[PDB]
Structure formats: structure tokens, C-alpha cells
């Protein structure tokens, strides 16, 4: 309707209810995180700290997931079983990952209660990532000892990263257990991340799907595609900032080097996906802990199959972790092909033009003759516009289902991004 009517309704109709909903759904989790933070600072024995965070994680899983949380509980116990029967092998990663894969597949069979499994898939993904990462860290020799039962459980049920929180390596959780002083930088990080979480939530809900009609005089197929993409991106950024605010409030999420404690846990970078340089930087800046996990474990293990095969295996692992579904396997396959073609085409262009057009910011150690000016700037802006166009075309599916909905939404856009990537690959092959 009218723009003046919409901006009259804006403040009290959407911005206050959305912020109230967010605060109401995160207040108890934040209270429990602060409770464990204050408890772990008193100086209890380590096993009491691990037991306390097991209890806190049980209560958080109950509060969010009423009684179906038992599924997640199984995923923990099973994992420890698989980490106790092969504690002496160099296959800990292989066995834990195969167990996780079998579990998630037998969950995808929809014989279990389907309505709530799709709700718990987030916490289950976090727990599975944690177990696989601990297995592979013990394999490679980065964790010295196989953890005791209570240490492993307090790691999986860490109340800061149980529901939303990102994956943190076993040693990050151990140092979180050790505790740090409550300096003002910690409170600054927690408050900044909470404020940005609420801002991203209200932007996704009450500023994103009403952008081009009201917030811009522009208003269509591509406009609604861009609006859906922006709304989904900012919902994900809400979840990311909330995850880092709840993992920094609990104690974890810090990096120290030579007596310099700096709380710098970052889960997502909105300024690298909303003003992108390339699709590689988009898939890397979308979720930094999950990108690190995928890259390190899956990619560095499957790097024998070849570069492209390893990239496809990484995107298949991502599709499995996030739950197999058409409009997600299709998006992830399109991302695989888009990032591959763009990366390799930009690499050949940077080798031929001897300029800095690499899919990422190259440093001052370049072999590149053209570093600044206008041609480099113009080409990088062209590729950034291409990345925004790809993001719109891909996120158009998550408006505001099955094969029919995906084909419909991608035919309404005349299959633009796929033809663009195909032409880019042809141009790559012609010049090299």
C-alpha cells in the first residue's frame, strides 16, 4: 500500500514485535551462558565445570526442543561410543565421520518424527561437526589425549555453542573452560554482537522484504529476487551474530598471542557478501567456522580425488550437514560450479593480464604488473556485479520447496546465472 501508511505502521507493527520475539527466544540462553561464565570463574575442579556445562546444555536443549532433544542426546552418546571403541586407532576421524554419515542418512529416511528433526538439524549439525573435528584432531596429533567422558560431553554440550553457536575446536573449548578475566573488552564484544544480532533480525524481517516498493523508488522478477536474497542473508547474519554473542558470553571465542587477549570470534562477515569481490569470498565469508571446518577436514582429506572432485565432495558434505533437500542441493551444486568457474577464469585472467584480478585480494608480494588504476578497478567491479547477480539468482528460492518450486523460480529468471557461468567457462576455455 501507500509508503506513508507503511512507514506509519513500521515502528509499532513490525520493529517492536520482531525485537521482542528475538529477545524472548534468546533471553534464557543468554542467562544460562552468563551463569556458566560466572561459575567457571570461581575456580572449581575441571570435571565440575564440564558437568555444569553438560547440565546447562541439557537444560538449553530442553528449553528450545521440548522433549525431542533426546535425538541430539543420542548423537552425543553414540559419538562417545565410537570415540571409545577406536581411541587407539589412527582412524578416529574415519570412524566418527562414517558414524555421523550413517546417523544423518537414517535421519533423512523420515521414519523418525519428521516435524522436529528438521528443527533440531542445527544442533545436530553442530554436535556432529564437533565430534568429527575432535576425531580428526586426535588423528593428526593436534589434540594430545583422547578426552575423558566428562570432558568430551562438556565439549559437545558446551552451553555457549549448543543451540546456535558455531563450531569451536576441542582446544578452544578447553581454554574456555580454563576461564579468562572479565575485562571490559569481553563485555564490549558481547554487547556489540548482541546489538548487531538484533539489528540484523529487524533488518531481515521488517526492512528486507519491503525494500524496493517502499525503501527505494525503483518499483518485477529480479527486484523480488534481490529482496528475498537480502532477507535470507540478514536472517543468517542474525543467527551468526547471536551465535558469536552467545559463544563469547560463555567464555569461548578468544585468541591470545604473547600476552594479548583479544576477543575476535567472527562467524560471518556481512560486508563481504553484501559487497562481494567474488563468489569464493562469499562462500568463505558466509560462515567462517563452517567454512574452516569444511575446508580443513573434508577438503584436506578428499584432496586426493582431485581439486574439482574435492570441491564437489565438500559441497555434498555441506548439503548433508544442512539436510538434503531440493532447492538446497541445487543451490549448492550451482555454487560449486559457479565458484569453480569464476576462480579458474579469474586466475587465468590474472596470469594473462598480469594484473590483480585474483578471486581474492592479492598482497604486495605479487608477480602482478598492474595493481591499481582503473582497469583493475573496473574489472573487479564487473566481477562484483556478477557476484551480486549470482547471489540474487541463487537466493530467489528462499522467498519472504520441491523440484517444481525450484524449476519455477529459476525459469522465471530465464536461467540467467547458469548461462552466464557457462559462457564464462567457454570464454575461459577459448583463452586457454
Amino acid at each position, epitope marked *: 500500500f501507500s509508503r506513508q501508511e507503511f512507514f506509519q505502521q513500521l515502528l509499532q507493527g513490525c520493529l517492536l514485535p520482531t525485537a521482542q520475539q528475538g529477545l524472548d527466544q534468546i533471553w534464557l540462553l543468554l542467562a544460562i551462558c552468563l551463569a556458566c561464565r560466572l561459575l567457571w570463574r570461581l575456580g572449581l575442579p*575441571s570435571y565440575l565445570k564440564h558437568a555444569s556445562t553438560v547440565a546447562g546444555g541439557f537444560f538449553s536443549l530442553y528449553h528450545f526442543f521440548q522433549l525431542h532433544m533426546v535425538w541430539v542426546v543420542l548423537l552425543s552418546l553414540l559419538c562417545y561410543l565410537v570415540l571409545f571403541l577406536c*581411541r*587407539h*586407532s*589412527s*582412524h578416529r576421524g*574415519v570412524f566418527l565421520s562414517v558414524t555421523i554419515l550413517i546417523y544423518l542418512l537414517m535421519g533423512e529416511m523420515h521414519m523418525v518424527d519428521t516435524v522436529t528433526w528438521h528443527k533440531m538439524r542445527g544442533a545436530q549439525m553442530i554436535v556432529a561437526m564437533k565430534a568429527v573435528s575432535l576425531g580428526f584432531d586426535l*588423528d*593428526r*596429533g*593436534e*589434540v*594430545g*589425549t*583422547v578426552p575423558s567422558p566428562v570432558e568430551f560431553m562438556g565439549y559437545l554440550y558446551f552451553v555457549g555453542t549448543i543451540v546456535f553457536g558455531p563450531w569451536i575446536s576441542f*582446544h578452544s573449548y*578447553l581454554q574456555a573452560v*580454563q576461564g579468562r578475566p572479565l575485562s571490559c573488552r569481553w563485555l564490549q564484544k558481547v554487547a556489540r554482537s548482541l546489538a548487531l544480532a538484533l539489528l540484523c533480525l529487524v533488518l531481515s524481517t521488517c526492512v528486507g522484504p519491503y525494500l524496493f516498493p517502499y525503501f527505494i523508488p525503483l518499483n518485477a522478477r529480479w527486484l523480488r529476487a534481490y529482496e528475498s536474497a537480502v532477507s535470507f542473508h540478514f536472517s543468517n547474519y542474525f543467527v551468526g551474530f547471536l551465535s558469536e554473542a552467545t559463544a563469547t558470553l560463555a567464555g569461548a571465542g578468544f585468541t591470545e598471542e604473547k600476552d594479548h587477549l583479544e576477543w575476535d570470534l567472527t562467524v560471518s562477515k556481512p560486508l563481504n557478501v553484501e559487497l562481494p569481490r567474488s563468489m569464493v569470498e562469499v562462500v568463505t565469508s558466509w560462515n567462517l567456522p563452517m567454512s574452516y571446518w569444511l575446508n580443513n577436514y573434508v577438503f*584436506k*582429506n578428499a584432496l586426493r580425488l582431485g581439486t574439482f572432485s574435492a570441491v564437489l565432495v565438500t559441497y555434498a558434505a555441506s548439503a548433508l550437514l544442512h539436510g538434503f533437500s531440493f532447492h538446497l542441493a541445487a543451490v549448492l551444486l550451482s555454487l560449486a560450479f559457479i565458484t569453480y568457474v569464476e576462480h579458474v577464469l579469474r586466475k587465468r585472467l590474472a596470469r594473462i593480464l598480469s594484473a590483480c584480478v585474483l578471486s581474492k585480494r592479492c598482497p604486495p608480494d605479487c608477480s602482478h604488473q598492474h595493481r591499481l588504476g582503473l582497469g583493475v578497478r573496473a574489472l573487479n567491479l564487473l566481477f562484483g556485479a556478477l557476484a551480486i547477480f549470482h547471489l540474487a539468482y541463487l537466493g530467489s528460492l528462499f522467498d519472504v520447496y520441491g523440484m517444481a518450486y525450484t524449476v519455477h523460480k529459476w525459469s522465471e529468471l530465464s536461467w540467467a546465472s547458469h548461462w552466464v557461468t557457462f559462457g564464462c567457462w567457454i570464454f575461459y576455455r577459448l583463452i586457454g
Partner: antibody
Amino acid sequence: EIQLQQSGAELVKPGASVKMSCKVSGYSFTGYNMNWVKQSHGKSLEWIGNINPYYVSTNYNQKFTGKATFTVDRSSSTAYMQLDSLTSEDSAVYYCARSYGSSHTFAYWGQGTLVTVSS
Amino acid sequence: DIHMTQSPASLSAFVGETVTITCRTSENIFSYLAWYQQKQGKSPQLLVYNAKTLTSGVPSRFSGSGSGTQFSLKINSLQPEDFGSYYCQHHYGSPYTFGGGTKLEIK
């Protein structure tokens, strides 16, 4: 009985490269990380790195990266470490030590290979 | 990485006496420490792991203790086969560092 038979001593010219060897007998070669450790003459021990024989991924000490490279041979169940550009300070005794399964404490050690760099 | 300060550098006693070696850790390692014994000319042997657990074969007179950043190894009734160098090595996580050593001799 576990036994890590480690190759003989080497006398290398400065700037050249050396390649130790550690033949494992007594257990499944691809079931435990193989650690490589360096000890100066009468000084403390230094953990060069390790190699996982199942998947050949290695894990180096940053002080020894680019200096030592680990390889394996499952057909002969033998782990090799190659040192590159041996300075006069690389004359030491190098041990191969198997991890104690669960822990990464070095349960079974070799006998040591003496690397001496001179002219 | 983690720096391990082992003390004393030298230590001498009589056959049957009791000695104690200390290992201070630069960081907190959650009682992840091993004690190795290396005699004159041989390779080290793992005596203690997890800062408290004796291995299969080592006599019961070796006693490990400590936690956090302070650990100790106590040897009661020194026998002639117990005089060598002793190294404390953390197995918290890579890179695993050792201690300076403690040359136990007879005087």
C-alpha cells in the same frame, strides 16, 4: 615385540641433504602416528614432527618446517625423514618414536641415527 | 608454543635415597604430562603419562604428581638402575615440547 629399526649414521657435507629411515616391525604400520624427534649432543629433545601412516597427512613443528619432510612406505612398512640444506647445527641424533595410541606420548622409540655435518 | 622449565639441571644422591624433579609449564596443560628416562647412550623410555599414571613395567617407586602448571616426579629408594636423564614432555597438543632435563648421578 615392537621394534623400530632405524638406519645407520650419516656424515653429510654442509648444504647437502640426508634421508633417515625407520623400518617398523611388530604392529600394523598404518595404525599409529610416527613421530620424528631430534636430540642434540647431550641436550634436550626436540619434536620434529609426525606422519599419520593411514592417510599420509603430516604435522610438522614450525621450527622445523621446510627443513624436514616425512614419507612412508606401506609395502615395506618404513618411515623416512629427509633433511634439506644441513647446517653445521643439524649434527644430532634423530629418533623415530611411535605414539602410545590414545595419548601422543612416545611409547616405543628407535635407537637413533647420528647425523654429522662436517668437511 | 609451550615452554617447559625442568629443575634442577643436575641432581645427585645415594643408592636408596629419595629425589624429586620439578617441571613448571608456561601454560595450563590440564595434567597432560609425561616423564621419560634416558640412560647413557640409549633411547628414552616412557615412565609416566597423564602426570600420574605409571606405564606397564616401570616399578612402583616412581610417583608422578601435580597439575596445572606445576608437576613433580618423586623417586623413592634410588636403585643403581635409576640414574639417568629425565625429561618432562607435555602431550596437550602439537607442537609437543620437552624439558631441559635432569641428569641424576651418584655421589
